[PDB]
Amino acid sequence: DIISVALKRHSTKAFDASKKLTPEQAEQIKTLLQYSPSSTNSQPWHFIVASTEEGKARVAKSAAGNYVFNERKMLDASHVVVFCAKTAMDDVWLKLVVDQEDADGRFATPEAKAANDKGRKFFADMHRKDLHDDAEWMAKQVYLNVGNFLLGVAALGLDAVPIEGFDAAILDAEFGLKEKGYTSLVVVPVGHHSVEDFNATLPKSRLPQNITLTEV
Amino acid sequence: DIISVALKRHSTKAFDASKKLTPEQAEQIKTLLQYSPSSTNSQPWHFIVASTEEGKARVAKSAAGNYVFNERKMLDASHVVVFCAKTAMDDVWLKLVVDQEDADGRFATPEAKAANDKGRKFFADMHRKDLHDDAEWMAKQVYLNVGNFLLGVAALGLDAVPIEGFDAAILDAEFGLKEKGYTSLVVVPVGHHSVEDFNATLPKSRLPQNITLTEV
């Protein structure tokens, strides 16, 4: 059951570089990235999946400075996902989303379709025009993607670790993300843990629900 | 197989008000909230789980203005989770986290424990002192929790819908969150869809991977 998975998964601190995702698992992790929900189906994200040694090493350059303890996880894991958010929400993206909803069969009439576009545009506008927080808003959708992904990959039997400990300016410049409209937020190596993963035998710790949760 | 679950789950547009979570499901969804990961195990969140008619109706007041289309979901569903983030990261919370890590058996020595505290404080300080983005940082952790939650409850066989379409200032004041150090971010009704959920028979739509995903 999924609760066992939630209780047994852990942040892997070191990966076995000789254990690769199966071809089928490599497909499945891309499916998880794609099929996450997002506010208005805005999907304001891009993913880089590095599985070559070259491409992981490029991503690993971002694990410099204070963040070297993360470098080896990025090099040793089978696949390394970089989760990136759009830096602004443009009308071309909003059109592409609704056209795709349309191509996929979600609208019965042109009017249903126009209403969807109008509603997405309205709610998007509150972030990009009124509140000026559309960067933050899109980044949140991407973290939601991450949350989905980590539970997903745990349920496939894979090890993983989310990493904020890396230099986004480096990683952005390494892949040309600013000029393309994106910024890197979280890196998630996926694979199988090695013997150096001290975190695999430690008990899980969370605050008690009497602190964090209220029922009404 | 979690990939099926990811491909079959949907944002429920209408719930059967007669169909309740089993008492066991009610406990399991609290377990998912608690055991989400977060950066440094900071767990910078609070949840309100409404199960009673009174409690749900309090939450549903936030579905005012042009967010009325969400009101029914909040009233008809069995359980309604309000995801809240801390509004600031204080040293009392950081201490509580590490003491809990300690009580749960994650430190071999007092020195291991002090090192953990030091590392959490260092990385937290980067957000609350250098970048002044600690609110955003914590809110991200909360969205991650959401993403975990949505996949988790779908794997328990429950229907749900994440909701940003509600008025957070109302919901905050309804539960006294500002003064307690919290702000509401996302609301997630959980239960079982009614036959009025038009979204249960619509195909899922996502942008294709040739736009959103790059392999290297």
Ligand SMILES: Cc1cc2nc3c(=O)[nH]c(=O)nc-3n(C[C@H](O)[C@H](O)[C@H](O)COP(=O)(O)O)c2cc1C
């Ligand atoms: C957004 C995010 C960023 C994280 N960044 C790092 C990281 O840079 N390095 C690391 O070793 N762990 C990192 N973690 C792992 C957390 O410390 C871990 O999730 C938390 O301590 C709970 O343990 P668990 O993930 O084993 O349940 C991160 C977690 C998340 C959610």
Ligand SMILES: Cc1cc2nc3c(=O)[nH]c(=O)nc-3n(C[C@H](O)[C@H](O)[C@H](O)COP(=O)(O)O)c2cc1C
């Ligand atoms: C953070 C968040 C906010 C959302 N807010 C609402 C909302 O207010 N009302 C609603 O009906 N759907 C809401 N949705 C549902 C999305 O529109 C839906 O996820 C998206 O269209 C993808 O369809 P799916 O969830 O069925 O896969 C929200 C989704 C997320 C992730």
Ligand SMILES: O=C(O)c1cccnc1
């Ligand atoms: O996804 C949606 O339909 C949505 C998101 C936020 C607010 N209103 C609608």
Ligand SMILES: O=C(O)c1cccnc1
């Ligand atoms: O969770 C961690 O251990 C973590 C998070 C950010 C940066 N370094 C470590």
